[PDB]
Symmetry: C2
Subunit: 319 residues, 2 copies
């Protein structure tokens, strides 16, 4: 029974997520906070949330809330999430998890000393189609994988008013490098062993695009390409000695294409429920099993990622 | 009426196809081939209607009838073989990998220049008519601003080449086909490569079986090159601009290309040919005729640079002395 969720903001993403909890298995949204109550209420009523707080401290002190979701702006994750973990309540922090590796680890540590769950929020790794790609790769399927690549391109970035600030959000890499690189490690069951790349960026700004070279734990190379400006499709391709899979919009896909060693390519089609519904369920389940961390979106994978992402922006905006 | 008389320094497997294209050109004609053993030369010399046969390379260089020598000898012998002919006062057309050492490639141009002789790396990709269309389309704004280009190349089996895993011999995936995509890509773009990094799959004391390159070009355009063995996927190259793109199948020997314009409709460009060698050859002839020592396309700069780039990777990987 149960599982009431508290929301730490009025982030435009809040509703879709709330819709998600509703489509979820055993979870309901209880409590929503702000710094400005009227702001919270307005959405608290727009949606069907029943409690309200003009402060995050409040949302925390409350006990009618079991776990909190922090979909706030980037440089405020750390403080926001630190105000919960220290206070006892479990956290579902968003991407970027952190814009600083150290900040990332601490977060996990104090979360542990408090014996309270802590996971980064990634819709992709829990989709029904993603689960099958991983299934197939392990069970023979494509022979061994030698190379994987990802292409992500947004036409405009004018709906992200802070796109060109390093300290705030970031660039193409901050924007969407974690998902693809986390995802691959997951479907392959291998850890990123190497990574170096290039990128486009004027000074005192962010990178409009970047192209990452990759190496995995098992003889499989990879390429990640995030871009702004192009109008090409976003698709991931897994290539094995015996097969291939192409995944369109891997973070919200319901379908994928598998090609065999013979020429035959088929379409896998697992249908659109809710896009958020899947990770929420996983999380709920993690909680039932009194677990501090997720076995998929593990601690090391989350830390490891911010580390890489930050060494890159370090590499660029500094020196 | 007169023609440039070509000399072939070896009895390479590629020789017959080269001779096929040579014969298809306007001003070329074959007149000599030489091997380190004589019948090894005459055997091929007789199947191909090639007059003259020499039993050594030295003889081929001494012959006053050969106006130029094509060297398709094994990788380790490019340097020594070219040095021989250029120092002997003959112009050379050398097969790639042009060399396995930057300084060696540099010296080769040093002697050619001191001998006032023509020298170029044999490279068919850059001369195809289809490639020209791509270059022009990009320069006239056909695709807008180029933000990303990529190239994938796969060879199911590499078991028709024994030395493939000898870093000393010919090399790995990057020695085998990395020079074409980087030179092809720089050439179509009008931009120079100014940054490159990558990862590769290799065992110790071995060459790479796979290879993934990340790179940067002047003017804000990024790229990725992927070369490998074992996969069965097609070999494609893609140029992505803000107003459209182009997909090139088997760029090194293709007669077609897939252009997609700003509006959104894609068309198939098409040209036909019997040999990938012809374009490369009569371009070479046109160079000899105009009396030049270097080619404006496959330049000294480009080649030397490409060699530096390829070897730098074998240095990181299988080395670090």
């Amino acid at each position: 029974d149960k599982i009431r969720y508290g929301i730490m903001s009025t982030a435009q993403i809040v509703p879709r997520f709330v819709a998600g909890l509703r489509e979820s298995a055993q979870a309901e949204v209880r409590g929503i906070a702000s710094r400005r109550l009227e702001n919270a209420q307005k959405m608290a009523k727009e949606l069907a949330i029943p409690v309200a707080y003009g402060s995050y401290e409040e949302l925390c002190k409350d006990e009618t809330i079991d776990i909190i979701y922090i979909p706030t702006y980037n440089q405020g994750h750390y403080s926001a999430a630190k105000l919960a973990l220290s206070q006892g309540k479990p956290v579902l922090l968003e991407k970027p998890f952190t814009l600083n590796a150290a900040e990332a680890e601490e977060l996990f540590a104090i979360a542990q000393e408090q014996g309270v769950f802590l996971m980064e929020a990634q819709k992709s790794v829990f989709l029904p189609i993603t689960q099958k790609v991983k299934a197939t790769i392990q069970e023979g399927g494509l022979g061994e994988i030698l190379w994987v690549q990802s292409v992500t391109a947004y036409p405009n970035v004018d709906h992200i008013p802070w796109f060109y600030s390093r300290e705030a959000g970031g660039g193409a890499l901050h924007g969407s490098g974690s998902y693809p690189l986390q995802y691959l490690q997951y479907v392959l069951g291998k850890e990123i062993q190497e990574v170096t790349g290039t990128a486009t960026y004027q000074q005192g700004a962010t990178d409009s695009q970047c192209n990452l070279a990759l190496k995995f734990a098992e003889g499989t190379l990879g390429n990640i390409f995030i871009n702004v400006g192009l109008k090409i499709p976003s698709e991931m391709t897994i290539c094995g000695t015996k097969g291939q899979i192409v995944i369109p919009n891997f973070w919200k896909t319901d379908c994928a294409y598998y090609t065999d060693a013979q020429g035959n390519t088929v379409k896998w089609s697992e249908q659109f429920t809710s896009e958020f519904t899947y990770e929420i369920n996983h999380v709920n389940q993690c909680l039932q099993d009194k677990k501090l961390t997720s076995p998929v979106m593990t601690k090391e994978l989350t830390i490891a990622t911010v580390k890489i992402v930050e060494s890159f922006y370090q590499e660029w905006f500094d020196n």
